[PDB]
Amino acid sequence: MILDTDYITEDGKPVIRIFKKENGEFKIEYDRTFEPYFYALLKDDSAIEEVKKITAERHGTVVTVKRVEKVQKKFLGRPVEVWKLYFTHPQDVPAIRDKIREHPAVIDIYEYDIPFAKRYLIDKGLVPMEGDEELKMLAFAIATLYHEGEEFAEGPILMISYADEEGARVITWKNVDLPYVDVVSTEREMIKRFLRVVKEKDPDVLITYNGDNFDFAYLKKRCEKLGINFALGRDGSEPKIQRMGDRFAVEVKGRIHFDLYPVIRRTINLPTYTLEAVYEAVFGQPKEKVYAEEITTAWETGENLERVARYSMEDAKVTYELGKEFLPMEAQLSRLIGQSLWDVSRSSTGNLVEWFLLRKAYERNELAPNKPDEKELARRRQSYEGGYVKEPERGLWENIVYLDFRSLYPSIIITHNVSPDTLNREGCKEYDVAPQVGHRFCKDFPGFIPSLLGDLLEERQKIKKKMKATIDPIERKLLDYRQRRIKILANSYYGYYGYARARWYCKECAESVTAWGREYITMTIKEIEEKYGFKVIYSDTDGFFATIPGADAETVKKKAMEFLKYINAKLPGALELEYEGFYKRGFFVTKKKYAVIDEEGKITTRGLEIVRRDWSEIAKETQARVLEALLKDGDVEKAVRIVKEVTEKLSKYEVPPEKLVIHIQITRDLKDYKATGPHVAVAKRLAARGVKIRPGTVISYIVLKGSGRIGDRAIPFDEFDPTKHKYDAEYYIENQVLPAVERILRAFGYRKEDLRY
DNA sequence: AAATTCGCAGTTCGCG
DNA sequence: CGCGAACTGCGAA
């Protein structure tokens, strides 16, 4: 199993390293034969002799073109002849590439910005994380001595905890009477012991939570101060910090540093991403939080250190547990994308698609288009029409079916061969024309992206069928993650086409996909009403809800299945409408906002405040109780009684302050805000206290009793003290509860006059 | 930091 | 000083 690749430099020459785990044995393979390169498109041939002359400088010495090779490659489906330029060292490429593009004779250059070690994985057809090799894993966390202001890492590390299959332990340098605590004499000896532990356990994966930006940088600063060689790498190296945007990421050579924080935030949507919040979300069990100030007071007063050690132990324990949950999924993602688990775990959707496509392009001799320059980026700013959304029939409905397209946008892409290399091709025998927008797509040959996407959808179906007859529960799970990631990958192509930064950007393709989508959904709606007497209650992009106005449940169901037979015979190729589900009742508030209930009693909610992480728990809970009484019992009265009991409790100040907290993310640098709403007002005051606020920080605030601008009465919930300040019962009644439930009850005629207290 | 568009809805401010 | 538009956040698909 390949874990990762990198290179080093020996006498000015690059040496690839392949990090592997085979039969339980760590191994490093070395390759001294791989030559860096890029491509150049010239206007003639006699221009190559001049171009080889081109040179630059980096490390004092001169940079030159090692050798040149004329090759034939497809570009956007059309054959092209390009000059491949080889160099001695990968860093030669950034140094000389601009001057070689500057040359009058060179039209363009390509594939000049692919990191050498990823180029190697691609060109050699190597795939990380293949096979069934069990990886040894180790989580760790630290507890530090924090003081207001100071300097980062001015205080010592107080404890280091770790956890794996053998359990969780804490290393510390004060006596703590707990069986999982190992006591040493100083900070230096505690770190040294942790190094020894890592070295003895020899894990393939080190799991942290935010280790990319806290844990490793803390250790690094302390290790310099204490004169420690922090040689976590399997090659004796120290952890390597890389800049990644405005933050950082940390590699440990020969190992995989798996920071759960970027994985979790991209994978689940939570109102906050503290480790306690994530543990509870994923596993449904609370985890106690111990705050910095208590840690510090405990250590400085020598009192109550057991609480601190237990907290530190639990950090490591749950980090290991979250690691076991998420690492298998990311390992399947690494294998699917063909890049290291380290990279893939820290990548966005867009980047994952590009790496997948770069590899497929190499396999098919397809030259990669470049990332857009500034002038091209500006030209990529126009938008286009998206999904079709019907104005809904507001109200409470019974016996409704949801019918939806299976993989609408991928279906369209493959059925109509929608690709930048098939767009407006000249001299083809057959074409498909996008409705409304009119782009023509050649059908004579499979398009680059359509063919890949067809392979993906077919592999996913084969996996799903194998999964049913797989006895081994573990293997079944792995197949589940693989099939799960293929679906997310397949569903990213539409968006990628419209992504201005994408190499295979194609606006005409993006808008032809949505045009076709609108056509098929609207055609299907027209037919079900006109031909089968259904009434379409609500439709958004790729499915709709419908019922037969006066009909029975069995009638709507049976007639739905009949309509599917009818319509699927009319739909071309891979397009397919399916019977998603039957729902006894549904309530449709507005576009994008509804809730439905299946026969078993499960309630599915879309867009409503219940599912928004920026509304108070009291509003959400109350709306969910109103909807349950309506959907589950069709009992309007009981609903109104629920709202009245809630407004009374708020009026009396009986509602737990915790349920009043509003969580809103800071989306930008605090200086960039044009206007300042409450969460911004709060964030600014915290910055002013020296609290750090970066984009992505979640502000959790409560509105205090008072009048005027809400932002002036809002405070961080942690500063809330019931003895000093009362919450604003009026705000939560008038701005949270009533608006959310009111928009539902207006359909039964009830006023906002009602119901109050 | 980065897949897209379609959409609702709260807070604040400034127009007239 | 009412009211609507600007800015804002997040969901949906």
Side-chain angles (χ1 to χ4, degrees), chain A residues 1-47 49-69 71-80 82-428 430-754 756-757:
Chain A
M1 183 176 282
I2 290 167
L3 301 184
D4 202 3
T5 59
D6 72 7
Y7 73 96
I8 68 201
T9 301
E10 295 198 341
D11 292 300
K13 312 278 293 164
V15 178
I16 284 278
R17 301 188 293 174
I18 305 98
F19 298 100
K20 302 155 123 171
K21 179 81 159 192
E22 292 185 353
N23 295 322
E25 175 192 332
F26 171 72
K27 292 189 292 185
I28 301 168
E29 166 176 343
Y30 296 84
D31 188 347
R32 296 184 164 66
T33 65
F34 196 61
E35 314 162 86
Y37 68 86
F38 72 87
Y39 302 100
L41 181 54
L42 275 66
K43 303 205 235 103
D44 56 327
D45 264 13
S46 172
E49 290 310 321
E50 282 209 16
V51 175
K52 293 179 179 179
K53 300 310 259 186
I54 298 189
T55 77
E57 174 275 333
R58 48 193 293 270
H59 275 173
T61 314
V62 296
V63 174
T64 189
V65 179
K66 188 164 82 137
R67 55 194 192 85
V68 167
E69 191 178 280
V71 298
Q72 205 235 121
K73 300 205 125 205
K74 305 139 104 64
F75 189 68
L76 298 199
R78 292 321 281 265
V80 175
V82 296
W83 284 102
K84 188 181 186 187
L85 316 181
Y86 293 92
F87 298 87
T88 71
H89 195 282
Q91 278 301 124
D92 289 0
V93 166
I96 200 178
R97 68 189 176 204
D98 285 339
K99 275 198 295 175
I100 294 169
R101 172 140 48 176
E102 183 178 2
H103 190 303
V106 189
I107 299 156
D108 218 350
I109 58 167
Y110 307 79
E111 301 194 17
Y112 51 75
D113 66 348
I114 306 307
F116 193 62
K118 303 195 169 111
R119 178 91 278 172
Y120 181 92
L121 283 174
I122 291 172
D123 297 19
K124 301 286 175 171
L126 296 185
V127 180
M129 306 310 284
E130 274 177 340
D132 56 4
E133 177 89 46
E134 267 286 273
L135 294 180
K136 183 157 180 177
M137 303 187 288
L138 177 70
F140 76 99
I142 69 176
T144 64
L145 187 77
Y146 181 76
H147 279 299
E148 81 192 2
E150 295 302 320
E151 270 320 281
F152 175 73
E154 203 171 311
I157 295 162
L158 305 180
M159 306 181 177
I160 304 175
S161 53
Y162 56 88
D164 62 10
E165 342 78 52
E166 296 176 49
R169 303 191 68 77
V170 179
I171 301 167
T172 188
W173 50 281
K174 281 181 192 258
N175 173 219
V176 180
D177 174 52
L178 290 173
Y180 51 80
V181 169
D182 302 315
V183 181
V184 295
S185 50
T186 65
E187 179 182 20
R188 190 175 198 272
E189 283 295 292
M190 162 193 66
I191 295 166
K192 270 173 54 57
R193 184 186 189 91
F194 174 69
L195 295 174
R196 192 172 334 127
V197 165
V198 174
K199 178 265 294 161
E200 266 146 50
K201 290 184 177 273
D202 198 26
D204 309 299
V205 184
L206 292 167
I207 310 169
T208 67
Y209 193 76
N210 202 30
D212 275 338
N213 290 284
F214 186 77
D215 302 61
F216 276 103
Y218 214 102
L219 283 152
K220 185 180 187 175
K221 189 66 101 191
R222 300 310 291 187
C223 278
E224 280 147 32
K225 285 227 138 166
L226 298 174
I228 303 164
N229 174 26
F230 195 48
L232 274 192
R234 259 161 174 175
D235 65 341
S237 56
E238 295 189 310
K240 200 219 229 163
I241 289 73
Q242 302 206 333
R243 232 166 64 93
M244 177 165 298
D246 287 353
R247 316 307 299 303
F248 301 95
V250 176
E251 310 189 71
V252 178
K253 290 308 164 158
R255 299 188 208 281
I256 301 172
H257 172 214
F258 187 62
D259 189 339
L260 286 162
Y261 178 52
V263 169
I264 299 303
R265 77 160 184 254
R266 289 184 173 108
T267 295
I268 69 177
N269 179 15
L270 297 169
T272 73
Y273 292 92
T274 71
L275 177 60
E276 294 66 34
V278 175
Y279 183 70
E280 190 167 346
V282 173
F283 291 111
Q285 290 158 64
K287 174 197 194 293
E288 196 192 347
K289 169 75 179 171
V290 175
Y291 293 91
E293 75 165 5
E294 324 174 64
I295 294 169
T296 294
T297 304
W299 190 267
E300 283 173 342
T301 69
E303 301 184 352
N304 189 252
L305 280 178
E306 288 80 9
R307 177 156 201 260
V308 179
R310 185 180 72 257
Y311 176 74
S312 156
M313 178 275 287
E314 276 174 7
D315 267 13
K317 182 203 264 272
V318 306
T319 297
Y320 181 68
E321 270 157 24
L322 289 162
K324 299 214 315 288
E325 182 71 13
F326 286 94
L327 184 62
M329 186 280 276
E330 298 277 334
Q332 291 309 308
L333 176 63
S334 161
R335 176 191 160 210
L336 178 67
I337 303 305
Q339 298 295 324
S340 77
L341 192 160
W342 192 94
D343 287 317
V344 132
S345 72
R346 292 166 174 80
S347 290
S348 73
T349 292
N351 244 251
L352 297 171
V353 179
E354 289 243 321
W355 284 118
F356 186 84
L357 292 180
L358 278 174
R359 180 177 286 263
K360 294 282 136 82
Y362 181 84
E363 300 170 358
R364 295 164 196 231
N365 197 31
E366 198 89 34
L367 182 72
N370 291 313
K371 287 167 172 162
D373 74 74
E374 270 287 313
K375 202 173 92 192
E376 236 301 291
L377 223 45
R379 181 177 181 170
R380 285 188 187 181
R381 296 314 180 166
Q382 83 275 40
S383 186
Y384 64 92
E385 196 179 345
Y388 165 87
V389 189
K390 179 178 189 300
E391 188 60 54
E393 312 277 326
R394 188 170 185 151
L396 183 57
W397 296 80
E398 247 164 321
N399 320 128
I400 59 199
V401 295
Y402 190 63
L403 306 181
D404 74 331
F405 287 94
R406 274 164 42 86
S407 314
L408 180 60
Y409 286 167
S411 289
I412 289 171
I413 292 167
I414 76 172
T415 298
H416 294 306
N417 208 32
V418 177
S419 203
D421 54 331
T422 61
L423 169 71
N424 295 324
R425 197 176 151 108
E426 295 162 6
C428 284
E430 194 182 5
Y431 294 91
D432 275 0
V433 185
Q436 316 161 65
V437 309
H439 303 301
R440 312 170 76 236
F441 299 91
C442 164
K443 299 295 292 275
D444 296 350
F445 60 94
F448 180 54
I449 284 170
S451 55
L452 304 171
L453 186 54
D455 297 343
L456 284 177
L457 297 185
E458 168 160 293
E459 208 200 326
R460 165 155 195 259
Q461 291 315 309
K462 301 208 189 317
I463 292 175
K464 283 166 96 33
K465 173 179 295 185
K466 186 155 295 193
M467 263 182 77
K468 308 254 189 40
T470 303
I471 315 97
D472 177 350
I474 319 151
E475 194 204 336
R476 186 152 73 248
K477 292 189 292 185
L478 295 198
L479 293 175
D480 188 53
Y481 288 138
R482 169 150 182 96
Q483 163 279 127
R484 254 153 86 170
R485 295 315 308 206
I486 289 173
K487 161 176 181 170
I488 292 171
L489 177 56
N491 285 338
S492 309
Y493 283 102
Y494 157 62
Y496 174 87
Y497 270 153
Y499 178 32
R501 308 189 74 74
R503 287 173 181 272
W504 278 275
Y505 171 83
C506 177
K507 204 221 56 169
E508 305 83 341
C509 308
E511 69 181 353
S512 296
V513 169
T514 53
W516 257 304
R518 294 194 299 280
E519 176 171 89
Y520 290 123
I521 186 76
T522 49
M523 179 272 282
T524 289
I525 290 174
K526 176 194 85 137
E527 297 271 330
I528 202 182
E529 287 181 331
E530 287 179 7
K531 249 97 169 198
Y532 279 79
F534 276 78
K535 170 58 168 206
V536 171
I537 310 313
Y538 178 73
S539 182
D540 184 352
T541 303
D542 62 353
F544 59 83
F545 297 91
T547 182
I548 296 166
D552 162 48
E554 304 317 83
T555 318
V556 47
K557 297 205 227 192
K558 276 187 44 127
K559 302 288 304 311
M561 305 301 328
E562 279 162 29
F563 171 74
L564 290 168
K565 197 194 181 197
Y566 169 81
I567 197 69
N568 281 320
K570 284 189 162 187
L571 290 167
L575 272 109
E576 175 190 352
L577 197 65
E578 62 176 10
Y579 187 93
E580 189 281 335
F582 175 85
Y583 301 91
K584 291 174 65 175
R585 286 188 195 98
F587 191 94
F588 298 84
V589 187
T590 198
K591 286 169 155 194
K592 307 292 198 182
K593 295 201 161 188
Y594 62 86
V596 298
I597 185 169
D598 78 12
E599 263 159 327
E600 291 178 285
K602 191 181 166 192
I603 294 187
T604 293
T605 319
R606 300 294 177 205
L608 285 167
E609 288 72 15
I610 317 168
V611 307
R612 294 189 54 94
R613 53 179 227 253
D614 56 338
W615 282 72
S616 70
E617 194 165 86
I618 186 49
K620 292 150 95 166
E621 165 208 291
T622 292
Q623 190 181 64
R625 286 214 287 165
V626 163
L627 283 175
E628 182 207 358
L630 266 36
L631 296 174
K632 190 98 94 88
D633 304 327
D635 289 345
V636 46
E637 293 177 350
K638 188 202 175 187
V640 171
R641 175 205 324 151
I642 295 201
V643 173
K644 183 178 179 180
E645 148 206 322
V646 168
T647 46
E648 187 181 284
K649 278 201 70 165
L650 289 175
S651 64
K652 313 293 178 55
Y653 302 91
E654 293 177 350
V655 169
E658 308 71 35
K659 303 193 142 132
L660 306 186
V661 179
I662 294 166
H663 315 272
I664 298 162
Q665 190 175 298
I666 291 285
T667 54
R668 71 201 73 184
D669 289 345
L670 228 35
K671 63 186 196 267
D672 295 331
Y673 276 106
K674 282 160 179 166
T676 86
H679 72 294
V680 177
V682 178
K684 294 189 170 177
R685 296 193 273 272
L686 295 189
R689 281 176 22 174
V691 173
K692 293 179 179 179
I693 315 286
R694 293 178 179 83
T697 298
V698 174
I699 310 292
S700 302
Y701 68 84
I702 184 173
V703 181
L704 291 190
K705 184 182 191 316
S707 51
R709 276 193 329 208
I710 293 170
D712 302 321
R713 328 205 289 285
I715 58 160
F717 178 61
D718 52 87
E719 296 177 10
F720 178 71
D721 181 345
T723 74
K724 293 179 179 179
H725 29 54
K726 252 181 196 74
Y727 61 74
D728 190 330
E730 213 52 40
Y731 168 88
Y732 288 97
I733 293 174
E734 293 288 312
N735 302 49
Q736 291 274 319
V737 169
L738 290 183
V741 298
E742 198 289 328
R743 291 188 281 270
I744 301 172
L745 295 186
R746 54 167 72 165
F748 302 136
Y750 289 98
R751 303 306 318 262
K752 184 178 256 182
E753 255 57 53
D754 289 345
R756 293 167 160 123
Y757 179 79

